[model samples]
Target: APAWTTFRVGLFCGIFIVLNITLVLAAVFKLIWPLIRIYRGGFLLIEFLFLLGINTYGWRQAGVNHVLIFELNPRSNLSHQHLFEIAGFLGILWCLSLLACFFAPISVIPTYVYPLALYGFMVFFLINPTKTFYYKSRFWLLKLLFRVFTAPFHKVGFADFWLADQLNSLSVILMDLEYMICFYSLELKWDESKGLLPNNSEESGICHKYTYGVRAIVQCIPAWLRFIQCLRRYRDTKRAFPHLVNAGKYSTTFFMVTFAALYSTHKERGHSDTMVFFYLWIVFYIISSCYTLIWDLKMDWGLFDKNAGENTFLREEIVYPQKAYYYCAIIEDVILRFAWTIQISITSTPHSGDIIATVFAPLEVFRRFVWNFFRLENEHLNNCGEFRAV
Candidate 1:
């Protein structure tokens, strides 16, 4: 059942959100934007996942039956209250950690400890055996995380696969996490007491060659998980076309990221920037994004209907009442999908690169949030299935 309709519940969370933004401003106006950029991409991943927590709120009120949709037992399912509160709580820790990096010029021992300790706590909170902090759901998510990792081997459930789909957006977040872990654990200059290390710069990158290979591997993980899931879907449903097509979508993802990695490496190595990889990267960027946008409209959203009627390109049956929101969302989806074009422009502009990249990540997340309503609505309407296992 839908629960916790009061604004009072999220009041605390709202305050925390306000504080996070304020702290970001504090973090922003300080000396190094790119220094901040180091953590921003990793933090962006956290932001999007929590954003989905809020999406459950929208899903419940709009009658998405997400519990049924995700095949969750009601007892362990997270309400918007818990989701919001947890995210806000984590935000406090995360942003405080960000500030910790800023203060004492990062020479103090505690600065690096902030993120490591906080990140460790995230793990501790999840796996703790105590009957606190929604232990059941924490395990539930851990279970899903495992299933996501073993995607090729596991059966594809709506809940399982969608989380992978969600992870697909966290593509660069992996690189950021890789950087975070490497910076905290390996790259720090212990004797010198290093402060605010060079980040996001390929020439002056952390962890060197070993880390780059590791980085590219971790970066492709979500895409590979998604790609494999489609294979598992083919294994399960025996459908050749749709799953094959879907698999190809993520394959394009793999190719582009690989190309980008190669390009970055070439650039870092003082080779010619306009190499074969760079040219092909642009090619796949166009190909992949086009593939993605079409999938969003035609297949995922179930839009571009012949009988869309007054809704134009939108679906015939609408859960959300406003067609204008639909129009805006479709436009938003298209625009955000192509926002990678800014990736080109962003690369050329050194000063504002990470700044734009930082802001740009959320726009995609916002697109996903808007897309969630329609995607869930599609499954609720068109593909209406019972629980996964018969």
Candidate 2:
């Protein structure tokens, strides 16, 4: 039985050595391939490291560490112990061999043979469940080490609480503005045609799409500034208002960055007067984007049913179609309904030359535009054909 076991171990080791040689050859080929050679090499390194780490910690504890070199089990108990010791020694040597193969200077046949020596330990692990006990043991040790290494950072987390307050405050402010804009658009005005409500296709009312577009683009500057001030508070907590403390620094950073980028580009390249309307609206787009990213990371248009109660406006649409005619209500229903609000909360109407009321009426147009842009030419919510869906 001992002789047979030895022969089996030798066969497995020989095969494992051959496989490693092949892996090295492939890595070398990757180094030579232009265009994406380096990128491929990086991927290979990542994969190799990941697999090695997992295998080393996973199977080494199983006790089969010896199959790497001592092809046959020695008959005596003392000899068996010696075989295990040798296997342990060779495991470390194999790891070193793998490292050498991966980073060694470019060479011909010499490099090909290097992998054969390195991967023996891993092959020995796969032979038998009882035999590979050491393989399992080693990997388990690695897992334990990894946990210890990462625990401190995860336990004493500082960024979450610090950023959460800021996000909560900003969200509340925007929610208030949304409520105000909705209320304003519903107000009764003297000028029937140019009222806060959108009158017809040709008419550009106080809350018209074109008007909001202008505001969205310009307000981007102030929004960017506000976001930055909040971020600066991360370093200076006293500077950040009590209401402005919250988790989501990453979201805030993105919002500010988008605003800054848009503001700079808009200023550098003078666009049409029509383009000016959406300054605030663009800020809205950025803010909404952040909200979706942090709390609701979704690629497709999906609604957060968890918050449907708070978003009562959209939920009421299916039941109260008639009362939902308020343009704000309609906009909310259409935009926030089954829509995935990912990164969509901060969007706003482009500011046309008109005042706040003027921009508020046409929110649906902006909503539709945003939906289209984000959906990649697909319509979000139950809407009609492409641009005309609004």
Candidate 3:
């Protein structure tokens, strides 16, 4: 498989997951560890990148016109193979970073520096000035990404809204981003007796307490941005149903996380009264998940058309030739939407909830992934009609 770039991407995905688990084992066993606790960030990141690599690949086969839709100059626009190569190359870097623990125990170059350097190089590469290896692509993404971050204030664009949707799926990655900083900062302080940290600052929960609160907040930011984008679009387009309804959809997530945080917060206070918040968390998730499912089928993916004709429940004139993918997508989407129930209900020991929580992220990313195939397809058809060109 590695002979072709697709297989190489798959191999990269495999290596990352294995490397991630290996790091987890190292963290838990202390057989060799840097105490990096979770792969929610790195794993989601790689998964997300790989998902797009394949998706842009899928778009071309279906004649998505995404290049023109996105309006990137063909000369600067990357092909799917190039994107796949980038993902796998990053995978190789991450795999090596995780394995770097093998040689760590040093002022002779510490383990934290491995990812830090990767991180450093990445940010620099994004802001990289020279023309090499899709620097324009990197710059385009960073510029668009920052726009989405300030979504409430910016003029709405399709890519801005679309990328914001992607961020909503990566809330956990954003959550992980917050914690990784504190954890590494704490660890850094522990080393270099005076390397710019006070143990008391972290020990007294400066780094940790805020993280719990901060982690939840970071997750909320994505949806908040989306909510704002919806309004910004409303302001721009003067549309109502999709914009306001979309805004309301994001609100439910805020409600879900709000109660979720409260439920956990009260639990730490040892209050049996926390049950109410727990119940609210479950109730909102059901509400939110169902609402999203309908919107995914209706507005986003645009499935379940009343007048689908020979297409069954799907809409008129889909891009993919195989209708079978439609049926399975509907089934898979419905099934995964309910996965949140387990998180709300299941409880064993050994922080059993934690395992469920971790496993839930990939399902979400996958659901989001499958959703995109049709979503973009729907967008393509819409453009070909009212918005077509080329």
Candidate 4:
């Protein structure tokens, strides 16, 4: 009887693991296949595989063959969490590569420099990001497959995250590509001799700095493109979805604020965490480190919002639906009035709000951490009818 019980438990665990893995893969390929068909863009998928395989191989080659790098030492508080952390680490890293490849040529920030920057962006923006862009739909093929195969799960809301999942994927991949491109400017590369390397450490720091710099440039181009789109979206402000323009504005504000904070801190302290004044510095530092991830998710959701304008969304105007969150904060003052509540809810951790409140109610330590870890303004917060009014 004991043996049978153990077997059943083991089998259940195995099944759950397999289901999760399948769900994730389905989500990725779903995004990839459609782009391939519509854009005649096998190159994107190929690059995705190449970068993913190579990054994996490189980590294994480095003697840290744990399957997931971030998992080995993630910031979570779970017991024996190393395993899951490592999985998420490798997962995000692979996704970053896919993102870099997604944007392709635009991602080429002068060969070596850009690649390094892309990697660095993954490390900084993704490693301890304010919020992970959990939706990535560009690999759309897998999403459809998962939905079909896992219909039972869908019926019971087992996989309700399908749409968000896809959006997160697209967010991860695109930002990974874009951030690296902008990390180091191509036009001024000739002038900036130290443009490709950090001013600090020799091996890891220099390389990491270069990686971040290149990604900055690559990411900037897309950001600029989106900025133009936002401008155009705004010109028709009086229309139904004028909220999208607000989303863009909020995203830009979040991006600028976070980047400015990071730049000032890094410039004054030279990328060292030693200069941190408060104990909450660690949390702030972590948020700053992974700021890009939130923006990536925000951007993808923004795209979804824009596309949604064409589709009818219940009773409300879908035009600027993406910017709903921003409008709430700015016009209705959700974040300003209930910043702590907002932070806790956005972190996505189980009961993170209660935990944060108990730990530092008066201090509001979580607010700074929230700013550091999750770029909330960049997200597409949606509300309609009574929900919007309330």
Local distance difference test, per candidate? 0.72, 0.37, 0.71, 0.35
| TM-score for each model | 0.86, 0.20, 0.83, 0.25
The better candidate by TM-score, 3 or 4, is: 3
> Could you tell me how far off, in angstroms, the CA of residue 265 lies in candidate 2 after the best superposition?
13
lDDT of 1 at 244: 86
Runs in model 4 lying further than 4 Å from the true structure: 1-202, 210-212, 218-226, 235-248, 254-390
Q: Rank order by lDDT, top first?
A: 1, 3, 2, 4
Model 3 — which ten-residue stretch has the worst lDDT? 31-40
Q: Which one wins by lDDT: 1 or 2?
A: 1
lDDT for 381 in candidate 3 is 75
Assess candidate 4 and give its TM-score to the true structure.
0.25
- lDDT for position 334 in model 2: 42
The TM-score obtained by model 1 is 0.86
Give the per-residue lDDT digits (tens) of candidate 3, residues 165-219.
8888877767666666776555455455223334533343344353367766877
TM-score of 2: 0.20
Give a tens-digit lDDT track for model 4, residues 178-209. Answer: 43443344322444433333432233223223
Candidate 2 residue-wise lDDT, 253-315, digit = tens: 445444544554465357445354346646655566555443321222232335456454233
Candidate 1 vs candidate 4, lDDT winner: 1
lDDT top scorer = 1
